[PDB]
Amino acid sequence: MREIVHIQAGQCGNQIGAKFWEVISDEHGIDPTGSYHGDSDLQLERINVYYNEATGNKYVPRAILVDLEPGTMDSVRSGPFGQIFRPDNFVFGQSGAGNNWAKGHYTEGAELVDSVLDVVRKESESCDCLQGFQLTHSLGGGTGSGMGTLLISKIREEYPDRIMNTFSVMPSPKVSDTVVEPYNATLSVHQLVENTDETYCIDNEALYDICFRTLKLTTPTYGDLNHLVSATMSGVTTCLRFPGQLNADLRKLAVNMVPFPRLHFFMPGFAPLTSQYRALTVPELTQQMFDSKNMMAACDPRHGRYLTVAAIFRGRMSMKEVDEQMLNVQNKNSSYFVEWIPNNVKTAVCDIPPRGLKMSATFIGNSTAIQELFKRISEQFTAMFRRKAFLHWYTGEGMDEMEFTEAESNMNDLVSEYQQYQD
Amino acid sequence: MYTFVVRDENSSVYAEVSRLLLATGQWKRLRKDNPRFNLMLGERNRLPFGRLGHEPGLVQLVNYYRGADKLCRKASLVKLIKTSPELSESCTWFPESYVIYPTDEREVFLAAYNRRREGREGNVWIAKSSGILISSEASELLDFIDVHVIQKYLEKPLLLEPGHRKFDIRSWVLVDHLYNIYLYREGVLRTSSEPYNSANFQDKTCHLTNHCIQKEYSKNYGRYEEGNEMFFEEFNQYLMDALNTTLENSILLQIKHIIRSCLMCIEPAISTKHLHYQSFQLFGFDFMVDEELKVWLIEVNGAPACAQKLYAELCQGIVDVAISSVFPLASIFIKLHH
Amino acid sequence: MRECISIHVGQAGVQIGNACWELYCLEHGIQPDGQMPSDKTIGGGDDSFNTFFSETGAGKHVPRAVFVDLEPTVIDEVRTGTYRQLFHPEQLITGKEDAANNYARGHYTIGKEIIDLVLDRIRKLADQCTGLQGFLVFHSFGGGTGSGFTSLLMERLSVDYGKKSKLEFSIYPAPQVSTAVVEPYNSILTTHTTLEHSDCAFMVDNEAIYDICRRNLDIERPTYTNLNRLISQIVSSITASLRFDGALNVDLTEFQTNLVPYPRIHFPLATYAPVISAEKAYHEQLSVAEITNACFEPANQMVKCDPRHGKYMACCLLYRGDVVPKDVNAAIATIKTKRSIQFVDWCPTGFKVGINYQPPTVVPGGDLAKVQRAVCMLSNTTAIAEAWARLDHKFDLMYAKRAFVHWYVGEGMEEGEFSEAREDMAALEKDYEEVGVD
Amino acid sequence: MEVIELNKCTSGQSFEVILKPPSDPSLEEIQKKLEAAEERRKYQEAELLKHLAE
Ligand SMILES: Nc1nc2c(ncn2[C@@H]2O[C@H](COP(=O)(O)OP(=O)(O)OP(=O)(O)O)[C@@H](O)[C@H]2O)c(=O)[nH]1
Ligand SMILES: Nc1ncnc2c1ncn2[C@@H]1O[C@H](COP(=O)(O)OP(=O)(O)CP(=O)(O)O)[C@@H](O)[C@H]1O
Ligand SMILES: Nc1nc2c(ncn2[C@@H]2O[C@H](COP(=O)(O)OP(=O)(O)O)[C@@H](O)[C@H]2O)c(=O)[nH]1
Ligand SMILES: [Ca+2]
Ligand SMILES: [Ca+2]
Ligand SMILES: [Mg+2]
Ligand SMILES: [Mg+2]
Ligand SMILES: [Mg+2]
């Protein structure tokens, strides 16, 4: 039993994390009270990867909820599945972080991180064989971005031989709360480059476009954006939660997806995305899965090359037809797959589809086009930093300009590193 | 959308085939080292046959038969004809040849050389390999070698008139993945502009019919025919006027016989019938015609060029019977049955 | 009678081993609980089948096997399988976390912590053997355990059992069913480290088994169960000489003597026939000549390659069923004058033939149809080097960029072992080309 | 074709057909490399913890 410890920090992290547990709980047949009411043993075969079992055949998510404000965590505890989380696993402060990376990372966050690690330690100790951690957070705020990366650095120090995986929401001016989001995101990306093995880059710019253009949502809300994130998170974790052969744990996924230690930022994709009773053929799932309009990172895959790709098909379908369509996508578009990593595309199939869909497909690509996302953030960062705009919010917390210069240089390096392998 | 790769930029035949495949809108060219290809216009040397047929979901075809070198190398051809029972040792359409190393056939070559000299027969032999020498003294030939082949130089060649000149016949044969033997309806005679002189063998301009040697060492290049190339329409008319016979009866039957014999002999060794990849190949047979209207096989080229006027028709035929047969889209050959 | 100990490493080795021992029991009439009615000597004996099975005082016939995997889920199915009663806990060894498709992780990091435990368990079985022949080692090339830990076990086995022979059943990686992009790395790393410790290795390419299942069994998407049922048939025909009365390949030493004159070239090509779908009521039973001719068709080989463009150094024919020598010689004569079969100059052009009258046994309800006669040809041809060339090419493509190399260095392996292992494969390809090309 | 060494038993027979005639590291050394790899892992982890301490 290879357990995973889940961590969600900040407003975004806790609202997306809550929806995630609501989704996979339904898939595994766990109700809001922790009782299982499923009709298939496939639901429980790997339930231990994300759930602890308590007395009375109760399943408790191995999840830790963290925030410097009590607000969003009070909503979670009042939400649909709020009663399913372990009460001791709610760790929150009162001051907040004010969308300030320095506050989450150096001042307000430092005061609260030890109590979070105490809960992480309690969960890890009761793990037969802990395999790693998964963190949900945004990079544009203060708690998830600043304190989230602080948590990751301290978790690595105490568990250096475990895998660290994150779902990181990238900021976008299209869906922005404050102007300092490029600062917070740039500072966090360098932390992620060093202290995570796998990061799913969830771009709020892409989530909005998908809701506006495809789903035909005139006024997308955060709830709408999070509906896409729940579906994607459920998809990318399918191979971890159900019996399978490919990418069945966090370490084997890293070995298949990360040829170079720093290039571990993935583009997730989902299909279908319907504005809904029509069956979707395997060819349709495959073409939509690879369509940029189904990408969650807001990067054009045809602007780069795929280093590695992981595809997951869910539902009852012809595995022979899945192989034919997957081989058709690669053989027809072979120029977009680097030739120095043979057979870099791996496919998995799970019989249990997500709720409300007869069939689905989740895309996980390590494409050099992801540099477009980091470039975008780098440009916005520089636009303000060249004039030192809004820096006083951070120097007032002890930070020096040099740390901004270094974070800027580090991310430009990451952009250059992607560009070198694209040629 | 079929995919193909190009690995022999020096191939004039397949540079045109490539151009045609693209002109169909249904074929896409990939980088030379991309493995996800349907067709490989491979290189002439060390073609990695062992890496073909291992791509899931891709029917792969290559434009060369692995092992066809046995027929397209002079030393190999001699060994193949002598040892193969199907060709026996007494096959009447191949000049008596011996393989000499600078196993070896030195002693055997001199044995038959003496029998003819004693009998007063012509002992004019020619030495060549994969620069040649034509002499009537076996000692001079062996000194020249110091792998090479020594075969009887045909002393009584059929001479085209006017000119009293030598020539050779080139036939293009296409073998597809099913091992159907297709002889191109169009051939070419590569003629010598200089009159044949059996007295001085050192002046090899009239003795060698090579298109390159004629244009470089001959003064009468292009006097009778454009580029020292006489096509079958004219050659047939000549045979009808001068010899009262046709190209089909006097020469073509023997050519088809020789083509079938050579290709059928190696079919078990090179056939891709039940193989994980399929092969086809365009061959270039070269024949000599003696004054008795008997056809002799000179050699077989595995990577031949085509006559300028015939690139279009032939290259299209390659796409039709060899490539489109395996990858259909949305006769100029004579099928030699067997 | 001399005993043989089987060792199954990794998922591939364990699952294949599970299928082989199920077939053995069906062939020897050993019920799932270990009882063998036809065995009249209770609690002991030195029959041919005792080379693979020991006996308890209660009449249980226990396989001389050890199952090793760094993850418990695969071996747990053996603990709860139909033949769970055959094995006892000491034979099944599992760890907490696997090698994550990382040769270095399975060889160095995890191998160092579990090697002594595996050897100790192997020592237990050795202590029961009056005259141990050696070991048969089942494993995959691409898995982190099958590649990394196997190479370590093979090194140690040469230390603890210097005089014993060691045979391999290696699963060659095929992308149609592979689970890791780095499998070419693990394949070449383990071949380099194991090359000097293996006396004879039988490579099975999943690509070949996969296409044989799709083509001859009408399986749309063959599973590991489909692949292992067919692989167990091949493995059975190879080991049948050790488990039954006979004179050909009666001990492990004979495999090297009959198939491997050049020590480094110890990878014989296996060809099996016929493979008939069981979903068809009647199938025209193939003759001795027909199944013998099929042994020279690449489509029936365990490794797709072209023996015509190579040379043979040795060739064994292993028949099971209704076969008499007269029919074998008649079929060989015909095939000899219709096939391109070339031996090296320094080796005789002949065939070592073995015939077991008992026709092949098939798992009830399986996919393979019962046949009146089958044959497995073991031929040492240089053409098998084509598999090395393919593997080495994919290795070169990734290593030129150092792709994924950091995962191995992170486990304590030095980057030099990559080139060192690749240089060895280069020498191996060169040895094959020298032996079978002019 | 020459058939030689024909052996027959109740369960089968074997023979040879000729068509044409012809024309280690020690335990100590292993433990060293295993310990060498383990020390390189310890060193790499020590550098990480030093980096994190900074
Ligand atoms: N024929 C066959 N091949 C298998 C089977 N199981 C795994 N493989 C192949 O083995 C390769 C992967 O190696 P595994 O044996 O699964 O991995 P492992 O030995 O358990 O080592 P770990 O990395 O620690 O899991 C892939 O190429 C699979 O195709 C099987 O049951 N039958
Ligand atoms: N036995 C023989 N009798 C008469 N002429 C001969 C001969 N062997 C060769 N020749 C002459 O030599 C010429 C070229 O010889 P050959 O074909 O062996 O060399 P080559 O390989 O360079 C040309 P190609 O590749 O087009 O065949 C022929 O055109 C022919 O006229
Ligand atoms: N997709 C999504 N993004 C969010 C959500 N809430 C906030 N964000 C994004 O996260 C950033 C703000 O970070 P936030 O989580 O509010 O700060 P924190 O609570 O201090 O960690 C902005 O870029 C927002 O666009 C949410 O519910 N869903
Ligand atoms: Ca007994
Ligand atoms: Ca040894
Ligand atoms: Mg907020
Ligand atoms: Mg030539
Ligand atoms: Mg495993």
GROMACS .gro file of C-alpha atoms and ligand atoms in nm, chain A residues 11-12 99 177, ligand 6:
model
    5
   11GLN     CA    1  -0.811   2.998  -0.091
   12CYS     CA    2  -0.759   2.851  -0.438
   99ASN     CA    3  -0.176   3.814  -0.165
  177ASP     CA    4  -0.727   3.947  -0.812
 1259MG      MG    5  -0.805   3.519  -0.273
   0.00000   0.00000   0.00000
